[PDB]
Amino acid sequence: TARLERMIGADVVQRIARGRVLVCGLGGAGAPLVDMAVRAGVGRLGLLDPDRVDLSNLVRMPQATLADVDRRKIDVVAERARAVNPDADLTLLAHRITPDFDMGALRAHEYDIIVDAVDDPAGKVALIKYAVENKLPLISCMGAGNKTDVTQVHRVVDIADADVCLLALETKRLLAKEGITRGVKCVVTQGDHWVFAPQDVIGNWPPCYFMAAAVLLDHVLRVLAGPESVEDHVRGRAVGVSTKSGIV
Template sequence: METHTHNWLERTELLLGSEKLELLRNAHVLVVGLGGVGAYAAEMIARAGVGRMTVADADTVNATNINRQLVALHSTVGRPKAEVLAERLRDINPGIGLTVVDKYIKDEETYILLDAARYDYVVDAIDTLSPKLALIAASLERGLPLVSSMGAGAKTDPTKLEIADISKTHHCPLAHMLRKRLHKIGIRRGFRAVFSPEPMREGAIILCEEQNKKSNVGTISYIPALFGIGCASVVIRDLIGELEG
């Protein structure tokens, strides 16, 4: 069976040129959190031709993920998200150097993961504040370029999406809480955030007591995907030297 692996990046090379495509082939990108945002970010990064990736998440696919998560199908319910995504990424690029970490990245695991390899970029798609803060702080401490997704839930307007330094985020509750925590440890700027200032819809959040989360937030199919694509665009454009600002 013909695999077509010889020319699958032909259109990307036509757009970017061979030298910039080679920069992507030689890059290693870490994506932490493979839910509604992170899986889309990872897939877009892989489809752009990044040669090495590490993806991390210990969660399994739940039926409630099907409305918005790339890895979630009725046929994948109960399977590890990292495993399902890894199959997709290897099918997109059979030559990808892929490391799969089936663990929740928090506490000591954050430092172990960041010190396990030399990364050219980190994508933070964690939706819980404390491990998110730890990943950001530890990445910046190591001088690693990073892009972070803010809250994608309870929103419906794709035209409100913005990408800016964390210091310039506004009207986003998660970004506000994160900035306050970062200020306490001396971090005020230094990484880009994908966010939306669209007001959160009333009644779209309910409290819960599930593992690693304290609330469930209503979501629509396309908003988390756009946040992930925004994160991927930052990574790709920065790696090839085309990100302004």
């Protein structure tokens, strides 16, 4: 990984490399985020998912193959990450996220940045509660299922301003019932979210999950570097800007 160091300072490069991130719910915007992180140069990862991959999980994550069906999600994701970078520090957790288990929460506060991608809203609100109570830096992605639009993309806003997305509204209601309404960050589209018909649905327009993966990648890179406004780092490291015509 040298083009990133060509872009941003090396100090930031080994700040990200000496970075620890925990990913919950590898059944959506998490596993592609895992690929992006391990290729960017991220070190410790905190994968946490008890399910096994399916063909729908095959279309979701890059770390999968028709020969990998029914294999544990964490196993496939970790082996692919190690293939990308043998020097990695992947950590298997399993640890289904029913609202009773909290040793994974012990490991969570042990970590640095917590990424939430739990497909179950109950698990999502449990993680948000735990992180808010322990003041941990948490990013709660509401996924990208049932979304269609691409002109407007996911942007990191507070849970107070969460809107439109059905999952975002459900998590907002659950958190307000629990008593927290502004502490946690979130990643929402603010775009059309079809409800479809009861058949269980899900959604999964293929570009939308990679939309979410890219946005989560960007936010994880923002928070993994020691707070410096990495835009400022590029400004002080690069030469041209090229907004209107080009500024040195």
